[PDB]
Homo-oligomer: A and B are copies of this chain.
Amino acid sequence: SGFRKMAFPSGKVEGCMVQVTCGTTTLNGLWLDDVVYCPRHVICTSEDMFNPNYEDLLIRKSNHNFLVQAGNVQLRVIGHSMQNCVLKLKVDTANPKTPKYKFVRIQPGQTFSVLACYNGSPSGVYQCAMRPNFTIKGSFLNGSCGSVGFNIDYDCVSFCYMHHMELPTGVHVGTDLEGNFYGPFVDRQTAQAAGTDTTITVNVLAWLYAAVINGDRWFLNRFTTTLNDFNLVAMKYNYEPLTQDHVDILGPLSAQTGIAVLDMCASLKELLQNGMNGRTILGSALLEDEFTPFDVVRQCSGVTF
C-alpha cells in the first residue's frame, strides 16, 4: 500500500533526448526515427523573443546552422521545416533507441510525466497535470525548453507536451508535438497571463478514493448530495463543474470501495466548506488534484510497462 505522486519510468524517453544549438541558443530536442523535434525559438536570442517574426528569422538558418548532439556524437542535419511552433530537423540517422510512440494532444485535467533536461541531458522526472487554464506547474530553468511530457501504455510512449515558455507568474506553457500551443499562449516574451487556476474536481475525488483504499477514511461522512447541489459548492470554490461523464469515469473506483460517487462528493463538499481542521489525507494538507481516476487504478493495481 501507500500512494505517491509517481512518474513513468523515463528510460525510453532518455534515449530520445538530444541537444540542439542554433547560434548561441541551446535547448533540447526529441529524436524519433530520423527527425528531431524542438521549439522553433531555438532560432532566437533572448532579444529576439519580444517580437519575433519566425519565418523571417528562419530564412537566415540553413541545415548546418542547427548543431544536434546525441551525447558526445554529432548528428547530420539534412533538412528542416517549421510546423506551427516546432521545428522538425531531418537527420541522416534514425535513432536506434526510438520506442513505439504516438503524439497525442491531451485534454485539460489529464496528467503526464515530464523529463526535465538541460543541454540534451536528463536532470529529473516528475508528474504534472495540464491545468484547466492550459498551464502546467513544473520545474524548468533556462535551457529546459524542449523537454517533453509523456505517458506510457505498456511499450508505447504517447508524447503530449513540449516545453516552450515560462510566464512572469512562474507557471509553464508549451505545445503538443505537432507544435500547437495548449491554451491561448504564444512563443513571444509578452504580457500573457494565465486565467483562473480551477481545481480538477474529478481528480480530487479520485484521490479521495485512493485515500480510502490506503486507509485514510476520517473524511467519510453520513451525507450524500446531487450533481447540481455539489456544483453549487464547486462553483464557489473555483472547482470544475462535475459532469455525468465524470461520474461514469469514477465508476470503477466506486465499485472497488463500495462508496457511491455522490457519497464521496458529499465528503468533498464538507472538506471544502469546513477545511481539513489541521488533519492530513495521504500526507497532504490540501486537496490534491493531479491524480486522474486512471492514475489511481494504475498505481493501486501495480500496472507495469
Contacts and interface: CB of A to CB of B under 8 A. Distances in A.
Contacts of A170: 1-2, 214-215
A239 interface: no
A36 to B, nearest CB: 18
Given A286-B284, A304-B117, A304-B119, A124 B1 contact: no
A64 to B, nearest CB: 26
Given A284-B286, A286-B285, A304 B144 contact: no
Nearest to A166: B1
Interface string A11-47: 1101100000000000000000000000000000000
A70 to B, nearest CB: 14
A118 interface: yes
Interface residues of A, number: 53
Identical chains bound together, number:
2
A157 to B, nearest CB: 13
Contacts of A171: 2
Given A286-B280, A302-B141, A122 B2 contact: no
Contact of A9 (B122, B172, B286): B122
A125 B8 contact: yes
A15 B275 CA distance: 45
